[PDB]
Scaffold this active site. Structure first.
Site, PDB file in Angstrom:
ATOM      1  N   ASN A 175      -8.825   5.573   2.614  1.00 12.88           N
ATOM      2  CA  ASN A 175      -9.419   6.311   1.472  1.00 12.88           C
ATOM      3  C   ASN A 175     -10.407   7.394   1.966  1.00 12.88           C
ATOM      4  O   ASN A 175     -11.180   7.129   2.897  1.00 12.88           O
ATOM      5  CB  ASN A 175      -9.955   5.250   0.520  1.00 12.88           C
TER       6      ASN A 175
ATOM      7  N   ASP B  12     -11.930   8.054  -8.988  1.00 13.69           N
ATOM      8  CA  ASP B  12     -13.269   8.582  -8.610  1.00 13.69           C
ATOM      9  C   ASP B  12     -13.133   9.996  -8.032  1.00 13.69           C
ATOM     10  O   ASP B  12     -14.185  10.635  -7.839  1.00 13.69           O
ATOM     11  CB  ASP B  12     -13.985   7.617  -7.663  1.00 13.69           C
TER      12      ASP B  12
ATOM     13  N   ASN C 107      -7.441   8.280  -6.262  1.00 11.00           N
ATOM     14  CA  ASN C 107      -8.306   7.266  -6.922  1.00 11.00           C
ATOM     15  C   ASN C 107      -8.961   7.953  -8.125  1.00 11.00           C
ATOM     16  O   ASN C 107      -9.115   9.183  -8.091  1.00 11.00           O
ATOM     17  CB  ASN C 107      -9.338   6.661  -5.959  1.00 11.00           C
TER      18      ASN C 107
ATOM     19  N   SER D 177     -11.382  10.569  -5.093  1.00 14.12           N
ATOM     20  CA  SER D 177     -10.962  10.335  -3.696  1.00 14.12           C
ATOM     21  C   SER D 177      -9.441  10.108  -3.672  1.00 14.12           C
ATOM     22  O   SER D 177      -8.849   9.867  -4.740  1.00 14.12           O
ATOM     23  CB  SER D 177     -11.716   9.202  -3.075  1.00 14.12           C
TER      24      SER D 177
ATOM     25  N   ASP E 277     -16.088  -3.740   9.385  1.00 14.61           N
ATOM     26  CA  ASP E 277     -17.324  -3.295   8.680  1.00 14.61           C
ATOM     27  C   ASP E 277     -17.951  -4.442   7.877  1.00 14.61           C
ATOM     28  O   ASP E 277     -18.900  -4.155   7.142  1.00 14.61           O
ATOM     29  CB  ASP E 277     -17.040  -2.125   7.736  1.00 14.61           C
TER      30      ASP E 277
ATOM     31  N   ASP F  80      -6.163   8.286  -1.166  1.00 14.84           N
ATOM     32  CA  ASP F  80      -5.736   7.299  -0.143  1.00 14.84           C
ATOM     33  C   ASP F  80      -4.565   7.868   0.646  1.00 14.84           C
ATOM     34  O   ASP F  80      -3.635   8.414  -0.002  1.00 14.84           O
ATOM     35  CB  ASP F  80      -5.273   5.995  -0.777  1.00 14.84           C
TER      36      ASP F  80
ATOM     37  N   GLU G  17       0.862  -1.221   0.000  1.00 16.50           N
ATOM     38  CA  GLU G  17       0.000   0.000   0.000  1.00 16.50           C
ATOM     39  C   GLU G  17       0.888   1.259   0.000  1.00 16.50           C
ATOM     40  O   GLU G  17       0.565   2.203  -0.706  1.00 16.50           O
ATOM     41  CB  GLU G  17      -0.918   0.057   1.230  1.00 16.50           C
TER      42      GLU G  17
END
Ligand SMILES: [Au+]
EC number: 3.2.1.17
Length: 129
Positions: free
Chosen positions: A59, A48, A46, A50, A101, A52, A35
């Site tokens: 994120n 989209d 990202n 967003s 989650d 990280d 990562e």
């Protein structure tokens, strides 16, 4: 800050990640490696819109507030900038929520593709824990 392998292992173990929701320490060191390459200052955007953040590339779509991710949540109730501290407390405590989650570590695409189903034990090989 760029951690050493056994350094990050020891810090993660102190922060209660060893076997958190059944994921041995090696899973967490393997995730961080692929990562961030163990770099607390790692940022990556990202597609989209967003971004990280930090050692476990948490994120801004769901977990933190970077102030430029429209139509997004702050479910760890933090500024994304706190995920880039030399102190990994915030990354660790937010990761504990992410992995809880229901999707576990599959939320880390690099864990799924690079750590899942491997000898993850190898990442804590030789470390004083
Ligand atoms: Au912690």
């Amino acid at each position: 800050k760029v951690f050493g392998r056994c350094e990050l292992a020891a810090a993660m173990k102190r922060h209660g990640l060893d076997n958190y929701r059944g994921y041995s320490l090696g899973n967490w060191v393997c995730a961080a490696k692929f990562e961030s390459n163990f770099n607390t200052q790692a940022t990556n955007r990202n597609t989209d819109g967003s971004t990280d953040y930090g050692i476990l590339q948490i994120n801004s779509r769901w977990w933190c507030n970077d102030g430029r991710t429209p139509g997004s949540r702050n479910l760890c109730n933090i500024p994304c900038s706190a995920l880039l501290s030399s102190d990994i407390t915030a990354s660790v405590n937010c990761a504990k929520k992410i992995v809880s989650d229901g999707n576990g570590m599959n939320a880390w695409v690099a864990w799924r593709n690079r750590c899942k189903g491997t000898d993850v034990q190898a990442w804590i090989r030789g470390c004083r824990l």
